[PDB]
Structures are given as structure tokens and as C-alpha cells.
Amino acid sequence: SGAIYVGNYRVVNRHLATHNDWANLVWEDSSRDLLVSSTTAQGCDTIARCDCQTGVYYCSSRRKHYPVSFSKPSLIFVEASEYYPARYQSHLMLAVGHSEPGDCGGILRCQHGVVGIVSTGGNGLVGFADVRDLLWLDE
């Protein structure tokens, strides 16, 4: 679990969005596993606007942060789960690092701010949904 809070927006994995997220929906994209909802309180986070390919992510299944080298956002095949059919997920970045079910929502950050959130994983890989291209989160 986990979310990004920026301005009057909350960014979560679409497959973990709550009834309240959907009742306050701003934007969602199943192909990216992202959903953004509106908030009344001002958020704690800032978003990176960069092309970094190294950073640090939070891994809830180890209660620890790990450094990672990650690929640029791209279209990657993701196997079927109880949440989605087998499909290509867009704007996804892969890295070698631990992850297991329950780790979605952990934040990935570089020196410039928040880069994205854990969205996929398996066999010593971890995948992150990028948020750096969502320029409207800042206004």
C-alpha cells in the first residue's frame, strides 16, 4: 500500500483505489495502473521533473529503502492477475530489487523528488509506474 500526496491530489495504484478515491476521481488510466483523486488538505510531497535512472525506493515487505538503477518508462508485458487481464502496461520502469505482493504503492525518489510508485514485481525484479510526465499534478 502507499500514495503520493501533492497539492490537492492523491496518486495511488488504480487497483488499490478506495470507494472514496473513485468518488473524488480526477483521472485514471488502467494501462498505467494509476488513479488520481482530489483531497481537501494540502499534500506533503513534490514531483521530480527529470530523466534520472537511479533512485531509492521503499520496500514495505522488508521495512527498508533500497537503491535501484531503473529502465526508462516503457510498454512492458504484465501477466494476468486478479486485478487485470494479461496486457501491456505503459509508462512502467523495471529494476532489480526485492518486491512481493503488498509492496505496491511504495515510493521511488531521486534527488529531484518523487519519480513513481511500485506497481509490479517478480523474481528479484520491481516495477514502478512513472508519474514525472503528469505535469498538471504541480498546478
Tell whether residue 91 is among the known ligand binding residues: no
112 is in an annotated binding site: yes
Side-chain-side CA neighbours of residue 42 (13 Å): 3
Binding site for ligand A1B4B (CB under 6 A): 15, 33, 78, 81, 83-84, 89, 99-101, 103-104, 119-122
| Distance between CA atoms of residues 135 and 19, nearest Å | 26
CA Rg, the chain, in Å?
Answer: 14
Annotated catalytic residue, options 21, 59, 103, 104: 104
CA distance 38 to 12: 11
Q: How far is the CB of 17 from ligand A1B4B (least distance, A)?
A: 12
Contact 81, 88 (CB under 8 A): no
Catalytic-residue membership of 29: no
138 catalytically annotated: no
| Contacts with Zn ion, residue ranges (CB under 5 A) | 48, 50, 52, 110, 112
Active site residues per annotation: 15, 33, 104
